[PDB]
Each structure stands twice: as structure tokens, then as C-alpha cells.
Unconditional design. Structure first.
Lengths: 90, 70, 100, 44, 69, 870
RNA sequence: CGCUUCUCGGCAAGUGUAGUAUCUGUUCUUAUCAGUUUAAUAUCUGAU
RNA sequence: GAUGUCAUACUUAUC
């Protein structure tokens, strides 16, 4: 029993730019094995990242436990990955 | 077009015995021509005044009976 | 309720058992589903509140928290003098979301 | 420069030649190409 | 369907004039029997008392307009 | 499909630029068919090619093709297929529809969602196929039979609703004729399903409609299986209908008294179960009707032992509160020894029946507390308080209810002295059951019987149960809060010992331990103000103000709830975490995408706006009002109700001049649940402050050429009128030209909003002498009753029901005049519905407003009583 | 020599359910009689 | 004016 809006990939917005890969792997890997993590390296895409997990239930438990996580002084938000919303800049 | 003549009720033969047994190709067209100058000029020859009681009157005998009853 | 057109009420003989509401639907009316200007409480039937059905929500059906009451628009339009506003059958509402 | 497409009082598009309505701007530009629009352009 | 079976006198789309007239006469008889002012007016208009007027109103509830058609 | 592994190319193709890594298709656009489901849709892979080779049954293949859009298609495609199947259910027929739906639902490789969609399609095609599924009644009853015995409650409720719809559509003779060979079947599960279906049909069609058929099925002496199926159907009808078989209790008891006398023990057990269900359904009732049932039951319970004796003991325990005081005292004095002798029974069903009967055996006078504490409570503590009873839910809840009944009857201290030793055990389920029993004993009886030698041990056991929690259940925190509320001032040498454990649990590697500590601090927040503890609460608030950096959002929401509980239990302007250093600290906390944490932040912002509005420099509120528009459009139904109150409090504090412009600018968003929430917030701001200051501005949003903004302004005006009520008599003339111009628009949504605003103005200004504006609104809403939309028809019906109560039933009868005898049936049905609504609203007022009707030839319709004058 | 205050110039809010108003790809110049239905049209069913 | 496929937008303090 899972909603169809959830997926294996999760998007993070308003992320700190001084965060390293180890801190992101420790924050994303707390709910399960993370398959991949891509951080933005563009001025138009700064503060956003995409974390794809190996399991769908682990990705849902990670997305349920990352919306509003305590970070450095920004309001980071975790949301589900959408194909029509990620390609809005093109 | 045939669809605009079939949906609006056109191409339907109607006989009006008041105005010399004229032909009408629509019920709404006959209702619009009933309160007109031609139907009033046809009804003025029989002596009936142009009122609202003779709107749906078609035959001359029924209109004469409605004029004599009032 | 007014949102789901397939929801039907009991419309039975209302006794002396007062209706209850859950925490998710606290303050809302039974018919108009409004939370402004309450005027009269809801009277449940004898079959809708018996045994394990006592102290339950009339709209949702879970555990009750507060007392159910109707708004002023239902008391002025004589809508509270009808039968018991208890939702018995649940059709196309909160059923497909649990399986998905 | 289309002299038939106008703006209504509800934030929509209206074709007075064919007397059609369109909610968004993407449907008004796609309504010029068709059978009824060509028939209204040829009849007038 | 169920509204005509639960509350009598509602009506439907295929309701005749005789049944509606009988329902209106029954509602008028119930309003005359319920309200004391109409019963007092009916007792002051005739020479009978309130009990005879109530018995005449109760005996006229069965087919107040006549046989149906 | 959703858990399948993907390659690197599929992961790279689903990501945009600017990121650094740290035949098989049937007829085209049909969805993917399963390899095991290529039997029902085997005729869809080939082309149709309709050219003099297309029978009617090939159109039924289209009824299969929409089924291909219904099983595994798109949800808009599934909605379109359901609409095409419901709109064409009479034209397609029930025959081929049932012949295509019966092997699809009977597949051994189905799923839960496909079965739910098939049940929804069968329920949706049941309203248009009335009086036509009588040959197809058995084919639907054979598919709906295992749905009532399923594990899920929603599927069982859907099967019961489908059985009730089939019983309402097929009548009573066809359901009795179809289930007549289904009673003497060889399979016991099919016979039980047929008995449950017959009980559901008897509950949906009435008890005397199936009472002589059930009496003839129970009185027939041909086999024990038919009598057992009839007794099971009677037991299911008694367990389904609680208080509905109470007038029909004597006719059921006269049929149940004929059983339990044959040589078959199964029929006697079924009759005892039916008698127990009839005693538990109508209780306290059926005292005189059960006098002839206790005499064989006592003989069967005293002469034999086994499952039938346990069923007779359960029936006696169910009928013992349904008797008098002397009868229950005589029955309890002769059944306590049989209950004590059955305590060492190895069977689980007999032990569950004994635990269910022990709760009803001691519930009134007659049973002394000393004998129940001496000879009943030690065997109940030695035989039922085990580890295996906490595994099953039905064996744990009944044991907890029996323990609560024994604590309410004998005493709470004698049960608390024996239940405190299992609180520090190694099992989580037994400790949770002991904590739930302690919470029930503290809530029902209290803690006045607990002395000082047991309260510290109970507090230590509760601390050991809370500190050794492995699950996410809130039973232990609720039990600790109930124990603290029952203690009150007796927990005064316990607050430092709890604070040292709550502060140590906030710093750990796990994330659920800090959330559990914050929930325990929030549950014990009201016990500190009544115990003269102000420094500990001020220390806990200063700790929670700095402990908001927990990375888990479930711990941050619990910390926010604990801070809100500490701010509610203490003063708003006397908190060591003051409002001047907390409201800017929660302004980035309100932008969280969580459900409970954002709702707690919105509740804290509303409390800080309602109680501490003088603690800001009138600048952070205008910045938080722009963030309040982003707090809506959430699927929780809790933050959207508090954001409107927070916006109303901000408009009452900082003046309704800045939030109204933001609410008008946020009304043009073209998104669901974002325009109604801003309209509700604007209505709450107009109701909290003066409604006149938002009066021309609401007249300005209709001036912009937009349909959504005008609809939002009309909804805001209707909600403000509904919130005002009697105060809308002065704002009716300013809204009357807007309601007159909104009803003449071509859009039906604006006309429905204007009809709702007119209904709110009629229901609010009823009885104030404003009938002219109500009549002017009714004269424009009267052509809006002929719409085809159900929402517009419901809005017109609400406007008519408001105008009948505001302008009077005479104006409603005059507006509905000359429409009952109309030639057009589409207007005559609406006029008859309006006349029925006016008669249901006011039936006595239609006598004086009735028109004068002349007398006919055979009948008379002239009212001669009201025509006479003195 | 150091500290503090004021002013000026440059530097991704998603999913599921209920209904509804529009164009976009298209169809009927079959001439009478009888039946169901429609306020009246339209449509369907059998015989030249 | 209707039909049947597709798209857009709207409503009921729906979740």
C-alpha cells in the first residue's frame, strides 16, 4: 500500500551550499541505502539536489522523514520527483 | 445545411388558413409571424381586433367564434 | 455530507443519545458541514449508537472527541427536526485511498 | 493581426467570427486552423 | 419515490389535480383542527359547538373532494 | 514495477543539466496487459474491422475494452471508462456485462485494487440495472460470497453494501429462491457465506420479510446441515442488527428454543451461539422471551463438558445482565465454580469464553469483593496473565476489559499491586498491555486507593516501560500522562527523577527516542503548573527553545508541540523563552513541507498572534502573512483551518489593510485548495475586524477581468455573509447590485456562487424586513433552476430553501405556481421537487397561501370553510 | 594610537475521488404509412 | 444541435 506520487527519487530545495557529500550521504542514508545523490553546481540550480534510493519503501520513509529537516540557516524542503516539474526550465 | 434545418425545426410544412392558407417552414417562424403586420392585415379583413387572445388562432371560423364570444 | 453526493443518512427515530464528533471533524455541522454559529446539538438514533457504536463520529465513524452540533442555518431552516444524520454506508469516499 | 479574436470580461478568448470560447492562450492560436474556422473565413 | 412514501402530500411529476386538491383539503382540515382560532370561527359561524365541528372535520377527512377520476 | 532496478542511463536521463554526481499492443493506445490476463482480453489483440461481420456481442467486446481501461489503465482513463459504463449500462445490458465481469473477478491471479475496481464497477452498474439481474443473482452472489469473510474491513463493507444493493434490486422472492439450494451444500465455508448473505439480505429487506422462510428452514427435519446453516444465519442476523431485532426477539427466540435438543453437538453449539448473540444484541431486553431458554442451557452446562458447555456458559453470561437482580444473583452463585474449574482449560476458545463471561459475571450486586479477591482473582491472575495472551488482539483486549472490570468491581489497588510486577518484563506486548490496564484503572477508578508504597514502584515501572520502547505506539506516553493526571500533587518527589531521564533521552543517536522524550514532556506539561513547579517548566522551555535543531522532523514537530504545551500551561508574557525571541525563531520553521510539524508551527503562530501580538515591531507579521499563503494546499485538513485564523488574528492586530491586499493578490493562482482557503481567510478577517473596511475592496476584485478572481471574491462574500448572519442587514444593499450582475453572467460557477451568496443572505437576514432584496435575488435566481449541472441545481435548491424561509412560503408558492401542471416534464419535475421542498419546509403555511380552485362536475375543490365570513 | 554611533557611491507545493463549459478528428437532401417516446422537434422499430 | 476519442479550465472548507 503506497501512493503513486511517491518514487525512488526525491528532490531537496533551499539546501546549504557549504554542505559536503559526506553530510548529505549521512542525512540521506539514515532511512536506508541511497543509490545516488546529485547536487546542483549551477547558479540557476543552487540549493537543490536529487537523491535516488534503491528501495521504494526506503525512499518513501526517507521522503517522509526529510520534509523540514534541521540544517544550516535556510528552509530546505523535501518533495517527490516529478517528470513534468523537473523540466520546467526547458 | 441540413443539420441546422433539422435541429431548429425548419423544413416542416405548416398551413395557416387565416392569411389565405399560407405556408410556413417552422413553428417558431409561424409564432413570430403571428404577431406581425401580415397576420394583422389578414385578421383586419374579418373584423377581429389585434389582441393577445387570437395569437394561436388559425382557422377563420374559430377566430370568428372567439371574437363573437368576447 | 454536501461534498459526497453518494452519502446517505439514517433518517431513523432520534432518541436521547447525543451525537459525537472526532478530532478531524470537530466543530463541523452534520448537514451543512459548517463550523460557524452552532445552534442545536445532534440527536442520534437507537440503532446508530448501541454497544461499540456509542461515542463514535457520525460523519467519519472513528473515535469521538467532542459533541456534535448543527449550525444556525440548519436550525432556522428546520433541518434539525428530521431523522438522525448518521452516515451508515460509505460509497466512493475514504475507500480507494486506503488500498492505494 | 487577427480581427476576430477578442478578450472577454472573464480573462478568456472569444472568436466572434465562429463565436467560440477558449480558456487559455494556447487554445486560441490552435482554433484558427480547422474546418469551422476555414468555413467561417470562406463564407465571410 | 421514498419522499412520497415517507412524507405524505409531497407529490411527484405525474401527480394529478384531484390528489393535490385532496391533499390541500386534508392540510386545510388539519390546520383547522389544530388551530383554535379557525375552530372558534367555525363554531361561531354555525350553531354547533367545538366538538361537533371537530367531528364534522374528522368525518370529512375520508375523500374530502369526492370519488377520484 | 515501482521497485525495479534501473540502469545508469535511465537515472541520467531523468535528471536535468547543472547537477554534479557526488503483436503485443492491443489496437494502439491500450495499457499493458498482464501475461496471465490474456484470456479475458484475447479478442482485443486483433483488429475489429467492422464490415458486415459485427454482431451485438462484439459491442460487448467494447464493454471488455473499457474494462481494459478499468483494470490497469490510467485513472482519468478509468474514470472515463466508469462514466461510459454507467451512462450506457441500460443499452449494453446486464447479461453480457455479467458474463464479462464474472470470469474477471474469479481469476486466481488478481489483486486487491483490481478486485476493488471490479466491486466498484459492479456497484455502479447496480443502480441502472434494476429488476434485470434476477437470472444473474446467483452469479453475483457466488463472487460476492468470499468478500464478506475477508480480512480487510473495507472489502467486507463493500461486499455487504453490494449484497444490500442486490437484495434491494432483486426483491425478496429471487433472493430466497437463489439461496435455497445454497443451504444444503457439502462445503461448510460456502454454507457459512450463504448464511451470511441471507442474514445481510434479511437485514437489508426486513426481519418479517424473511422470518417465515427462516422458520421453515429451521423447523424442517431432514439434515443437521440445514439447521446449522439456519442457526448460523440467525446468529449473523443477531450480530449484524443490534437493536433492530428487538421487536422481533420473540419470533427469533421461539425458533431458537427448538434447537439444542438433538444428538448433533454442532447444531446445539450453533443454537447456543445464536442465543448468546440474541442476548448480547438486545440488552437489557428479552427478559420474558428468554424464560424457556435457560432451563435446557443450565442442564447442558451442568450435565456435559466441552465446547457446548463453554457456549452455554457464554450464553448464560450474556443473558445474566438481561435478567433481574435475584435471577442474576441465583445464576452467579451456581456458575462461579464452573468458571473456576474452567480456568485451567488448555483450549484457547474456552479460555476466551471464560474471560468474556468473567467480565459480565461480576458487574452488579450479589458478588462480594472479598470472595472475588480470595477465590476468583488469584486463579484469574495465575491462569490468564500469561505471555501467550498478549500475542492475539482478541485475547489481549478481552483480558484488559476483564482486568478493568475486576478493578472497577473489587478494587484498583489490589489490581495495581499485582499488575506492577509485569511492567519491567522483557516482552513489549505484555508491558504494553499492563500499561494500558494501568491507564484504564487510573482513568476509570483513579489513584486514590494507591498508597505511598506502590506509587513509586508504579512510577518506576512506567519509566522502565517508556525508556525501553522499541515501537512507534503512543500507548506508553498516554498511560504515563494518565498516571500523572491521576497522581496530581502526589508526584512532587518525582519531577526531578523524570526530568533527569527526559533530558538524558534528548541527546542520543536514535531519532525516535528524542521524539518520545518530547512527547512525554508534552504529556506531562499540565502536571507541573498544578504542583507549584515553575522553575522546572522554565528550564524545560529554555531547553526546548535550543533543542529545535533536531534533524528528524518527527522530533521537531514533537518539540514544537511540547513548546506549545509549555506556552499554554504557563503565561504568554512570563516565559523564560519569551515571545520576542521565539516568533522570529519560528519564521523559518513555518516553511517546512511536513504535515504535523507545519501544523504545529501554524498553531504556535496563531497562539502568538492571539496572545502575544504586542511582542513584535509590526514588521514580522506582514512578512509572515505572505508565507501563510504557502502554508495551504496541503492534504492534512488541519493547517488550512488554522492559517485562516492566524491571518484573521494578524488582520485584527496589525489592521485589515495589509493582509487584504495579499489575500486579493493570492486569489489568482489557478490551483485547487488555494483560492477557497484565501477566501475563507478573507472572510475570517472581515468577521474578526469591521466588515465595512473590507466592503469596497471586495467590490474591487470583481472589477478585474478574471473569472477565477471573481469566483473567489463571490465565495469570500458568501462566506463572510454566512459568518456574519444577523449583521448582514446593513451590507445587503452594497452586495445587491453585485449579486444582480453576477447572476446574469454566462458562467455557471459564478451563477452558483451568486445563488449561494443569496442563500447565505437569506438565511442570515431572515426576519429583519429585508424581503425586497430577497425577492430581487429570487427573481434572478428563478431562471437558474433549469440548469443541467448538479452543483448548480443544488445551489438553486439551497437558494430556494433560503428564500422560502426568508421571504416566506407564500412567495415560494407564488414563484412555483403554474409549474406543477406544466406540459414540459423537465420543468414539471423541478417544479414538483420545489413544491415538495416547500411542503417539507413549511406544510402548515401552504394552507393560507393556496390558490382558489373552482369546483368540477363530479368533484368539488372549493374551500367552503374559509370562504364564509361572520 | 585604539573603540562606538549616523550619512553617501559600487558590488520544484504533489497525488487520488465526485460533477461540469469549450474548440480540435467526423456523420444524416430516403419520397410515404403504422407503433414507443417527446410540450412540440429530433431518434428508433417493420412494409414499397 | 447531437454523437464518439483527445486537450484545457472550473466547482463542492473532499483526502
Amino acid at each position: 500500500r503506497l501512493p503513486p506520487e511517491v518514487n525512488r527519487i526525491l528532490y531537496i530545495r533551499n539546501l546549504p551550499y557549504k554542505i559536503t557529500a559526506e553530510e548529505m550521504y549521512d542525512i540521506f542514508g539514515k532511512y536506508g541505502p541511497i543509490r545516488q545523490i546529485r547536487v546542483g553546481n549551477t547558479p540557476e540550480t543552487r540549493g537543490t539536489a536529487y537523491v535516488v534510493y534503491e528501495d521504494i519503501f526506503d525512499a518513501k520513509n526517507a521522503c517522509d522523514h526529510l520534509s523540514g529537516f534541521n540544517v544550516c540557516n535556510r528552509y530546505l524542503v523535501v518533495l517527490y520527483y516529478n517528470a513534468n516539474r523537473a523540466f520546467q526550465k526547458m | 445545411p441540413y443539420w441546422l434545418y433539422k435541429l431548429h425545426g425548419l423544413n416542416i410544412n405548416y398551413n395557416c388558413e387565416i392569411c389565405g392558407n399560407y405556408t410556413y417552414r417552422g413553428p417558431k417562424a409561424f409564432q413570430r409571424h403571428f404577431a406581425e403586420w401580415r397576420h394583422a392585415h389578414g385578421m383586419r379583413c374579418l373584423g377581429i381586433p389585434n389582441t393577445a387572445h387570437f395569437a394561436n388562432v388559425t382557422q377563420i371560423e374559430d377566430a370568428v367564434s372567439l371574437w363573437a364570444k368576447l | 455530507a454536501k461534498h459526497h453526493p453518494d452519502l446517505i443518512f439514517c433518517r431513523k427515530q432520534a432518541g436521547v443519545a447525543i451525537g459525537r464528533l472526532c478530532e478531524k471533524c470537530d466543530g463541523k455541522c452534520v448537514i451543512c458541514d459548517s463550523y460557524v454559529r452552532p445552534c442545536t446539538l445532534v440527536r442520534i438514533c437507537d440503532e446508530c449508537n448501541y454497544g461499540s457504536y456509542q461515542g463514535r463520529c457520525v460523519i467519519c465513524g472513528g473515535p469521538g472527541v467532542s459533541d456534535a452540533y448543527y449550525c444556525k442555518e440548519c436550525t432556522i431552516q428546520e433541518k434539525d427536526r428530521d431523522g438522525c444524520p448518521k452516515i451508515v454506508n460509505l460509497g466512493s469516499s475514504k475507500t480507494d485511498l486506503f488500498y492505494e | 493581426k487577427d480581427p476576430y479574436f477578442m478578450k472577454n470580461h472573464l480573462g478568456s478568448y472569444e472568436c466572434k467570427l465562429c463565436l467560440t470560447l477558449h480558456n487559455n492562450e494556447g487554445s486560441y492560436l490552435a482554433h484558427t486552423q480547422g474546418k469551422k474556422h476555414q468555413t467561417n473565413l470562406a463564407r465571410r | 419515490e421514498h419522499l412520497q412514501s415517507k412524507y405524505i402530500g409531497t407529490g411527484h411529476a405525474d401527480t394529478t389535480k384531484w390528489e393535490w386538491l385532496v391533499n390541500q383539503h386534508r392540510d386545510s382540515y388539519c390546520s383547522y383542527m389544530g388551530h383554535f382560532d379557525l375552530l372558534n370561527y367555525f363554531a361561531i359561524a354555525e350553531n354547533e359547538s367545538k366538538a361537533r365541528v371537530r367531528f364534522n372535520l374528522m368525518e370529512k377527512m375520508l375523500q374530502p373532494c369526492g370519488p377520484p377520476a | 514495477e515501482r521497485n525495479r532496478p534501473l540502469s545508469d542511463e535511465e537515472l541520467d536521463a531523468m535528471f536535468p543539466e547543472g547537477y554534479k554526481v557526488l503483436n503485443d499492443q492491443p489496437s494502439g493506445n491500450l495499457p499493458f496487459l498482464k501475461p496471465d490476463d490474456i484470456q479475458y482480453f484475447d479478442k482485443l489483440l486483433v483488429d475489429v474491422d467492422e464490415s458486415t461481420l459485427s454482431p451485438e456481442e462484439q459491442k460487448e467486446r467494447k464493454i471488455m475494452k473499457l474494462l481494459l481501461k478499468i483494470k490497469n489503465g490510467t485513472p482519468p482513463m478509468r474514470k472515463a471508462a466508469l462514466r461510459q459504463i454507467t451512462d450506457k449500462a441500460r443499452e449494453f445490458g446486464a447479461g453480457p456485462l455479467f458474463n464479462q465481469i464474472l470470469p474477471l473477478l474469479m481469476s486466481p491471479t488478481l489483486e486487491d485494487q483490481e478486485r476493488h475496481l471490479l466491486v466498484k464497477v459492479i456497484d455502479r452498474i447496480l443502480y441502472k440495472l434494476d429488476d434485470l439481474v434476477r437470472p444473474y443473482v446467483h452469479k453475483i452472489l457466488v463472487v460476492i460470497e468470499p468478500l464478506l469473510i475477508d480480512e480487510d474491513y473495507y472489502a467486507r463493507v463493500e461486499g455487504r453494501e453490494i449484497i444490500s444493493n442486490l437484495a434491494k434490486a432483486a426483491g425478496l422472492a429471487t433472493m430466497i429462491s437463489t439461496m435455497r439450494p445454497d443451504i444444503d451444500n457439502m462445503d461448510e465455508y460456502v454454507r457459512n457465506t450463504t448464511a451470511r448473505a441471507f442474514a445481510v439480505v434479511a437485514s437489508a429487506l426486513g426481519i418479517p420479510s424473511l422470518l417465515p422462510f427462516l422458520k421453515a428452514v429451521c423447523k424442517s427435519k431432514k439434515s443437521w446441515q440445514a439447521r446449522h446453516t439456519g442457526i448460523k444465519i440467525v446468529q449473523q442476523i443477531a450480530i449484524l442488527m443490534g437493536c433492530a431485532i428487538l421487536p422481533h426477539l420473540r419470533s427469533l427466540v421461539e425458533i431458537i428454543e427448538h434447537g439444542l435438543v438433538d444428538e448433533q453437538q454442532k447444531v446445539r453449539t450453533i443454537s447456543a451461539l445464536a442465543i448468546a448473540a440474541l442476548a448480547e444484541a438486545a440488552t437489557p431486553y428479552g427478559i420474558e422471551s428468554f424464560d424457556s431458554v435457560l432451563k435446557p442451557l443450565w442442564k447442558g452446562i451442568r450435565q456435559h463438558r466441552g465446547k457446548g458447555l463453554a457456549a452455554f456458559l457464554k450464553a448464560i453470561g450474556y443473558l445474566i445482565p438481561l435478567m433481574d437482580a435475584e435471577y442474576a444473583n441465583y445464576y452467579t452463585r451456581e456458575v462461579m465454580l464452573i468458571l473456576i474449574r474452567e480456568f485451567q482449560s488448555p483450549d484457547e476458545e474456552m479460555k476466551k469464553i471464560v474471560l468474556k463471561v468473567v467480565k459480565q459475571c461480576c458487574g452488579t450486586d450479589g458478588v462480594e469483593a472479598n470472595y472475588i479477591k480470595t477465590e476468583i482473582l488469584p486463579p484469574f491472575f495465575k491462569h490468564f496473565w500469561q505471555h501467550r495472551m498478549a500475542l492475539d488482539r482478541r485475547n489481549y483486549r478481552q483480558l484488559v476489559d476483564t482486568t478493568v472490570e475486576l478493578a472497577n468491581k473489587v478494587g484498583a489497588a489490589e489490581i495495581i499491586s499485582r499488575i506492577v510486577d509485569d511492567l519491567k518484563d522483557e516482552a513489549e506486548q505484555y508491558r504494553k498491555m499492563v500499561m494500558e490496564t494501568i491507564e484504564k484503572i487510573m482513568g476509570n477508578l483513579g489513584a486514590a486507593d494507591i498508597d505511598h508504597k506502590l506509587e513509586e514502584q508504579l512510577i518506576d515501572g512506567i519509566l522502565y516501560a517508556f525508556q525501553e520502547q522499541t515501537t512507534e505506539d503512543s500507548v506508553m506516553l498516554n498511560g504515563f500522562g494518565t498516571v500523572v493526571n491521576a497522581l496530581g500533587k502526589r508526584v512532587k518527589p518525582y519531577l526531578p527523577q523524570i526530568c533527569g531521564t527526559v533530558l538524558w533521552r534528548l541527546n542520543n543517536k536514535s531519532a525516535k527516542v528524542r521524539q518520545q522524550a518530547a512527547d512525554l514532556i508534552s504529556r506531562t506539561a499540565v502536571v507541573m503548573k498544578t504542583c507549584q513547579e515553575e522553575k522546572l517548566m522554565g528550564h524545560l522551555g529554555v531547553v526546548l527553545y535550543e533543542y529545535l535543531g533536531e534533524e528528524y522532523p518527527e522530533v521537531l514537530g514533537s518539540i514544537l508541540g511540547a513548546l506549545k504545551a509549555i506556552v499554554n500551561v504557563i503565561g504568554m508574557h512570563k516565559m523564560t523563552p519569551p515571545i520576542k525571541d521565539l516568533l522570529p525563531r519560528l519564521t523559518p520553521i513555518l516553511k517546512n513541507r511536513h504535515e504535523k510539524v507545519q501544523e504545529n508551527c501554524i498553531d504556535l503562530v496563531g497562539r502568538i498572534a492571539d496572545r502575544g501580538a504586542e511582542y513584535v515591531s509590526a514588521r514580522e507579521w506582514m512578512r509572515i502573512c505572505f508565507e501563510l499563503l504557502e502554508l495551504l494546499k496541503a492534504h492534512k485538513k488541519a493547517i488550512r483551518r488554522a492559517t485562516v485564523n492566524t491571518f484573521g488574528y494578524i488582520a485584527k492586530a496589525i489592521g485589515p489593510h495589509d493582509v487584504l491586499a495579499t489575500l486579493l493578490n493570492n486569489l489568482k493562482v489557478q490551483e485547487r485548495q488555494n483560492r477557497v482557503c484565501t477566501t475563507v481567510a478573507i472572510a475570517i478577517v472581515a468577521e474578526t475586524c469591521s466588515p465595512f473596511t473590507v466592503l469596497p475592496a471586495l467590490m474591487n476584485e470583481y472589477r478585474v477581468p478574471e473569472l477565477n478572481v471573481q469566483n473567489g471574491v463571490l465565495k469570500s462574500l458568501s462566506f463572510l455573509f454566512e459568518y456574519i448572519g444577523e449583521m448582514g442587514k446593513d451590507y445587503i444593499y452594497a452586495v445587491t447590485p453585485l449579486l444582480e450582475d453576477a447572476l446574469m453572467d454566462r458562467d455557471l460557477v459564478h451563477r452558483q456562487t451568486a445563488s449561494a451568496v443569496v442563500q447565505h443572505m437569506s438565511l442570515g437576514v431572515y426576519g429583519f424586513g429585508c424581503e425586497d432584496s430577497l425577492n430581487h435575488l429570487l427573481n434572478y435566481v428563478w431562471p437558474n433552476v433549469f440548469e443541467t449541472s448538479p452543483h448548480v441545481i443544488q445551489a438553486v435548491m439551497g437558494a430556494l430553501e433560503g428564500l422560502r424561509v426568508a421571504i416566506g412560503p407564500c412567495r415560494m408558492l407564488q414563484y412555483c405556481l403554474q409549474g406543477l401542471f406544466h406540459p414540459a416534464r423537465k420543468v414539471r419535475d423541478v417544479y414538483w421537487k420545489i413544491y415538495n421542498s416547500i411542503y417539507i419546509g413549511s406544510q402548515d403555511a401552504l394552507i393560507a397561501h393556496y390558490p382558489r380552485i373552482y369546483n368540477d362536475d363530479k368533484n368539488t375543490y372549493i374551500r367552503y370553510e374559509l370562504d364564509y365570513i361572520l
